[PDB]
Structures are given as C-alpha cells and as structure tokens.
Amino acid sequence: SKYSQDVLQLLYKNKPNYISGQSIAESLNISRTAVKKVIDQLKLEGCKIDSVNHKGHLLQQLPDIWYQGIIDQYTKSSALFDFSEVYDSIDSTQLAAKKSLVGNQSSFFILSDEQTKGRGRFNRHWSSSKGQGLWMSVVLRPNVAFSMISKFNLFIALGIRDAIQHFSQDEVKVKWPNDIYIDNGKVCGFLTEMVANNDGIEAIICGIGINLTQQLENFDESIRHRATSIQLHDKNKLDRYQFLERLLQEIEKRYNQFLTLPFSEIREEYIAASNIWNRTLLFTENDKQFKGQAIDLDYDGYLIVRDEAGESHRLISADIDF
Amino acid sequence: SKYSQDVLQLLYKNKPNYISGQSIAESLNISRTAVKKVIDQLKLEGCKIDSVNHKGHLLQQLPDIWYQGIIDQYTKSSALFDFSEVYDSIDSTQLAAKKSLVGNQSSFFILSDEQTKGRGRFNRHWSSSKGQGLWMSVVLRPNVAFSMISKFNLFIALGIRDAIQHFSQDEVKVKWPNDIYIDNGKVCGFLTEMVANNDGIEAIICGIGINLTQQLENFDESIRHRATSIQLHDKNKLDRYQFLERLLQEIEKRYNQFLTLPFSEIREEYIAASNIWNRTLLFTENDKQFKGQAIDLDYDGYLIVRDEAGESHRLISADIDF
Numbered sequence: 001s002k003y004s005q006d007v008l009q010l011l012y013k014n015k016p017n018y019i020s021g022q023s024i025a026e027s028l029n030i031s032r033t034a035v036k037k038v039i040d041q042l043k044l045e046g047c048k049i050d051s052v053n054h055k056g057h058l059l060q061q062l063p064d065i066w067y068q069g070i071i072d073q074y075t076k077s078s079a080l081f082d083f084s085e086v087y088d089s090i091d092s093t094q095l096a097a098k099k100s101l102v103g104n105q106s107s108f109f110i111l112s113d114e115q116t117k118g119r120g121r122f123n124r125h126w127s128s129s130k131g132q133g134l135w136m137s138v139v140l141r142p143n144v145a146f147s148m149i150s151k152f153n154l155f156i157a158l159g160i161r162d163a164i165q166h167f168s169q170d171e172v173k174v175k176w177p178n179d180i181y182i183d184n185g186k187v188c189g190f191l192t193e194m195v196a197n198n199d200g201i202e203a204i205i206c207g208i209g210i211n212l213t214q215q216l217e218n219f220d221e222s223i224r225h226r227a228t229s230i231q232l233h234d235k236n237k238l239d240r241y242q243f244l245e246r247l248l249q250e251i252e253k254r255y256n257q258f259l260t261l262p263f264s265e266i267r268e269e270y271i272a273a274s275n276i277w278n279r280t281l282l283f284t285e286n287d288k289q290f291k292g293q294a295i296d297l298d299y300d301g302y303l304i305v306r307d308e309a310g311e312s313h314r315l316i317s318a319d320i321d322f
Numbered sequence: 323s324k325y326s327q328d329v330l331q332l333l334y335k336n337k338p339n340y341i342s343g344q345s346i347a348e349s350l351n352i353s354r355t356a357v358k359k360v361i362d363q364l365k366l367e368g369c370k371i372d373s374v375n376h377k378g379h380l381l382q383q384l385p386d387i388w389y390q391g392i393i394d395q396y397t398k399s400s401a402l403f404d405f406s407e408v409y410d411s412i413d414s415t416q417l418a419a420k421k422s423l424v425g426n427q428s429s430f431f432i433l434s435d436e437q438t439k440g441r442g443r444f445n446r447h448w449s450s451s452k453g454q455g456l457w458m459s460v461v462l463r464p465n466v467a468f469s470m471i472s473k474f475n476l477f478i479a480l481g482i483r484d485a486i487q488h489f490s491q492d493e494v495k496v497k498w499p500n501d502i503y504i505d506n507g508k509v510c511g512f513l514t515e516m517v518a519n520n521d522g523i524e525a526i527i528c529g530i531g532i533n534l535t536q537q538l539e540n541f542d543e544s545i546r547h548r549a550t551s552i553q554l555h556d557k558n559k560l561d562r563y564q565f566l567e568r569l570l571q572e573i574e575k576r577y578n579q580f581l582t583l584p585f586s587e588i589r590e591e592y593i594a595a596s597n598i599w600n601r602t603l604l605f606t607e608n609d610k611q612f613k614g615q616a617i618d619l620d621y622d623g624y625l626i627v628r629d630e631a632g633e634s635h636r637l638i639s640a641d642i643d644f
C-alpha cells in the first residue's frame with residue numbers, strides 16, 4: 001500500500017507508546033478503515049504490532065525485511081546521511097550507488113534485501129542471500145587528499161568490527177585491509193571505490209556486505225568453512241534493525257575520526273584488533289603469488305611484510321589469504 | 323523518422339558513389355516512397371544530397387549537427403570504441419558517461435550538440451554553445467597502475483593538439499596539464515576523471531570540449547579575450563565531421579602510445595609543443611595563490627616550478643593561469 005511505509009514510520013516514531021488508528025488517520029489524511037487495512041497487511045508481512053481496544057497500536061518487532069519508512073527515520077536523525085534507497089532486490093547496491101551519486105553531492109546509502117550480481121574485490125562473486133545479510137553501499141564526500149584517502153578503510157574497519165562485536169559473544173577481528181572475521185570465519189567484507197582526479201575526490205562508495213543470520217547450510221559449499229554470520233555467534237536472536245542502527249552509528253563515528261585524526265591515533269587499537277600477525281599469509285600480485293608474514297603496520301597504515309625470500313615490503317594494500 | 327539515421331548511414335558508407343532509392347529501400351525493407359520522404363527530410367535539416375534522375379543520391383556535405391547513423395560508422399571501424407551515444411542536448415556528456423559506464427566494461431564516447439550544465443575542472447562553468455563546438459566524453463578501460471595513470475593527460479593532450487593543428491593555419495600549443503591554445507586563445511580544455519581503488523581502475527572518463535566555429539561574439543564577454551575557436555584560425559570552412567574523424571584517430575593513436583611507451587618518448591615533443599615556458603604563471607592552491615616559472619618537465623610528467631619565493635616544486639598537477 002502507498003501509505004504502508006508512512007504507517008510503519010509513525011508506529012516506529014511513537015515507540016514505546018501506543019497510537020490510535022484515528023491518530024494515524026489524521027496524520028496521513030486517510031480513513032480509519034484504510035489505517036486498519038494497512039496494519040493488517042503489515043502484520044501479514046510479519047510485523048509484530050500489539051493492538052488493544054481503546055489504546056491503538058504498538059510496533060513490537062520488525063521482520064527480517066528492510067522497510068523504507070523505518071530507514072527514513074534513521075536518515076532524518078543522521079547529520080551525515082542525507083537519504084537512503086531501500087530495495088527488495090537489485091543487481092548490486094554498489095552499481096546503484098555509482099549511478100545515484102552522479103550529478104549531486106549528497107551523502108547517502110543504498111540497502112537491498114538481496115543482490116543478484118553482488119561483487120567483491122577484483123569482481124569476485126559475492127553471495128547475497130535474501131533476508132540473511134546486510135548488503136549496503138555508502139556514498140560519502142570526503143574533501144581529502146589521496147595521501148589520506150587510503151586511511152578511510154582502516155577507520156571504517158574498526159567501526160564495522162565494533163558494530164558486530166556488540167552482538168557477538170565471540171571475538172571479532174579485522175583482517176587487513178577489508179575483512180571482518182569471527183574466529184576463523186569471514187563475517188564481513190567491504191570494498192571502497194572512488195571517483196576522483198588529481199584535483200580531488202568527487203565521492204567514495206563503500207560497499208559493505210555483512211552476514212547476519214546465515215545458517216552454515218545457507219553458505220555455498222565452497223565458502224562454508226571460511227564464512228560465518230553474526231547469528232552463529234549470538235545466543236539471542238539478532239535483530240537486523242538494532243544492528244543497522246549500531247552499524248550506522250559506528251560508521252558515522254569512525255568517518256568523523258578519519259576526517260579529524262591521523263591514523264596514528266587508532267594504530268594501536270587497529271593492531272590489537274587485527275588477526276593477521278604471527279601467521280604466514282598468501283599474497284596474490286597479478287600472476288605471481290608468494291608467502292609472507294605481517295611484521296608491522298606503519299604510521300601511514302601500510303602493512304610491512306617479510307616475504308618468504310626474506311625481502312621487506314611496504315604495502316598500501318594487498319589481497320591476502322590465510 | 324525511424325529510418326533517417328539508417329538512410330544517412332547508407333549514404334555515408336557509399337561515398338563517393340551514388341545509390342539508387344530502390345537500393346536504399348531493399349536494404350532497409352521499406353518502400354521507395356518512404357526513402358524519398360526521408361531524403362527530403364534530411365535535405366530540410368541541411369544535408370547536401372545530390373540527386374540525379376537515373377543514378378540516385380550522393381551525400382555531399384553534412385550540416386553542423388551530430389548524427390548517430392554517421393557516428394555509428396565511426397565506431398564500427400574503430401578497434402577501440404565499442405559504441406557511441408549522440409545527443410542533441412544534455413545536461414553534460416560527462417554526467418552521462420559516468421552513468422553509462424556503470425556495470426559494463428565497454429569503451430565508448432558520448433557526444434552532444436549542446437550542454438546545459440557543462441562543467442570544467444573544479445566545477446567551473448563550461449560554455450557549450452549549440453552547433454558551435456565538440457562536447458564529448460570518452461570512457462576507456464586502461465589496465466594500469468596509479469603511478470602511470472597521470473600520464474594519460476600528457477599523451478591525450480598531444481593527440482588533441484595534432485587534430486586541431488591539422489585545421490589551424492596558426493600554431494596550436496599545449497598549456498599543461500589540460501588546455502589547448504591557439505596563440506593567446508583557449509580552443510580546448512579537457513578533464514580526466516577515474517573510477518578506481520587500490521586494486522585498479524574501473525574506468526577513466528575524459529571530458530573534451532573544443533570550440534569549433536564560435537565567432538568572437540559567440541563567447542561570453544567574460545572569456546572572449548581568452549577563448550578562441552578553430553574556425554577563427556582556418557581559412558576554409560571547418561567541417562565538424564572531418565575534424566571528429568581526425569580527433570578520434572589521434573585519440574586512438576595517443577591512447578595506444580600511453581599504454582605502450584613511457585612518457586620519456588614524448589617528453590621532448592611535449593616540451594616543444596608547450597606554451598608555459600619563459601613566462602610567469604599564477605598557481606592556485608586552495609585559498610593560497612602564488613606566482614612561479616615553469617623550469618622543466620621531468621621524466622614522470624611532473625612540472626618543475628620555481629615559485630616567487632625561490633622554492634622549487636614538483637607538481638603532478640596544478641591549475642595555472644597566464
């Protein structure tokens with residue numbers, strides 16, 4: 001229904017109080033009968049809405065579906081995010097962000113319950129199971145130099161890690177430069193692209209995929225031993241809206257840190273949260289591939305590596321396997 | 323008409339021979355009467371088409387309007403350009419290229435007879451007079467490292483300069499890093515943007531604006547002393563199709579040079595074609611602005627500058643005025 005999101009938004013905004021159906025009707029300039037029909041539909045879609053006879057309605061719990069009217073409430077209260085686009089299915093939120101950013105200077109994000117052509121780094125396929133993960137692309141407008149842009153990944157990694165950690169009973173670690181792990185399982189990967197020239201950056205687009213409630217059987221046989229979800233490390237039922245709120249809050253906090261603090265101020269924190277140390281790694285560089293150890297993380301965020309031939313390397317980035 | 327471009331394309335492809343209206347009809351599976359109606363329309367739009375009684379039709383000259391069916395012939399015979407989009411009016415060919423490149427790996431360009439929101443570097447307004455200039459954006463897919471990408475501007479500058487020089491009786495010079503001049507007048511500026519991350523480049527988009535036939539009165543009073551067009555330096559009537567062909571040929575040649583030769587191999591040529599030497603320049607760097615002289619152009623394409631305080635600088639880029 002056309003007013004379904006608006007009814008949902010009024011229910012969300014009035015928590016924890018009940019609102020009468022009459023009040024919803026006067027707000028949306030529709031009939032009492034249209035409001036009850038919308039509320040039935042929302043209940044059908046799995047919204048837990050308590051209705052009592054003289055009080056009205058109380059949104060108790062959302063289903064595992066993204067709802068524009070709810071996310072709209074998140075962007076209205078965000079200084080950073082001007083708006084959001086919430087899709088049920090899409091080729092890729094990253095493809096949609098790169099089209100939507102052209103010709104404007106807005107900061108926004110794009111969410112989809114499923115992706116049919118999710119892509120990771122180097123155009124590797126990314127599994128985006130409907131209803132089971134957060135598939136999102138974030139467009140921001142950092143007015144920064146190239147010598148500074150690579151640090152965004154280091155800061156954002158810590159925000160994602162903290163957001164996940166808030167819901168994980170197990171330790172959440174960061175695999176430099178763009179992987180979040182729980183024990184031995186990849187729970188998130190992200191990818192940051194930019195539109196730029198030597199005069200500056202028009203936008204960055206950070207594509208974030210986080211496995212929320214996959215059962216092991218929900219991962220393809222090829223990635224099952226290296227993928228995990230937040231639910232597999234949470235004694236309580238993970239609530240995708242509670243997590244998204246925490247995740248937007250940490251992204252905002254770490255983005256403002258990235259714009260105002262040198263990497264030196266999170267370097268120790270980043271090292272302490274990393275899981276790449278004391279462990280041999282597999283580096284892929286075009287056709288060649290070599291092994292190495294992560295020795296240090298310098299003040300610019302570069303990984304210092306000792307390869308198997310004993311040579312040292314200072315890497316702004318790499319793709320490494322365990 | 324739906325078959326107007328196809329009729330035009332057949333006329334172009336058969337130069338310098340006449341083709342009968344019957345032959346056009348059998349090729350397009352339309353009637354002899356529809357073909358003559360299309361040819362009348364094309365003549366109305368300013369196509370010079372010779373028609374003789376038993377021979378058919380010969381395209382003699384195109385008007386100052388871009389025609390998809392003609393440009394299609396250019397991309398079919400180009401190894402590099404997969405396709406093109408030809409618009410009569412657009413906000414900006416650069417905005418359209420950045421939308422069109424998403425989700426594919428095609429190399430292509432976008433042409434528009436006019437732009438309503440043309441933008442140069444730093445979002446400075448760009449005047450795109452309808453029918454008087456070439457407003458185009460070129461999307462390419464260089465598989466190259468960032469240490470190499472800045473050289474593209476140096477190579478492409480030489481292609482544009484040569485294309486213009488072929489039609490100018492006066493000397494065409496290059497103002498580093500993205501201006502083409504004829505004597506004291508800016509005849510072209512271009513702007514190269516990229517979509518990229520530390521793993522590589524998804525695309526570059528080179529926005530090229532070239533003044534073709536502006537009379538001085540056609541330039542705004544604010545830019546008239548610093549802008550010029552090719553026609554103002556050509557004794558013959560500049561033909562936009564002949565120029566576009568030459569320009570696509572030089573762009574292709576210099577792009578392949580950029581992918582296969584170090585800048586050292588065009589360095590002397592670039593220096594010899596530059597007009598920034600032996601002349602004080604105005605540098606703008608955020609809020610500050612200083613004066614300086616261009617001392618050299620190193621092997622990486624960096625401008626070596628002596629500023630007014632006597633300090634040396636090595637600039638991958640800058641915005642400089644005369």
Ligand SMILES: Nc1ncnc2c1ncn2CCCCNS(=O)(=O)NC(=O)CCCC[C@@H]1SC[C@@H]2NC(=O)N[C@@H]21
Binds near residue numbers: 124134
């Ligand atoms: N669900 C999965 N869970 C764990 N492992 C998996 C999964 N599927 C594939 N594998 C294994 C290969 C891992 C790929 N290698 S990677 O590139 O280094 N890693 C990355 O994380 C970069 C991908 C970011 C994804 C986001 S989703 C929203 C946005 N839109 C879009 O299209 N992309 C971004």
Ligand SMILES: Nc1ncnc2c1ncn2CCCCNS(=O)(=O)NC(=O)CCCC[C@@H]1SC[C@@H]2NC(=O)N[C@@H]21
Binds near residue numbers: 447450
């Ligand atoms: N017609 C003009 N002739 C001479 N001078 C002029 C003119 N109009 C403005 N001025 C003065 C300010 C000069 C601006 N400063 S700049 O940025 O350093 N110079 C540049 O050349 C970069 C602009 C590239 C334009 C292309 S057109 C197709 C594509 N689509 C789009 O939107 N852009 C690109």
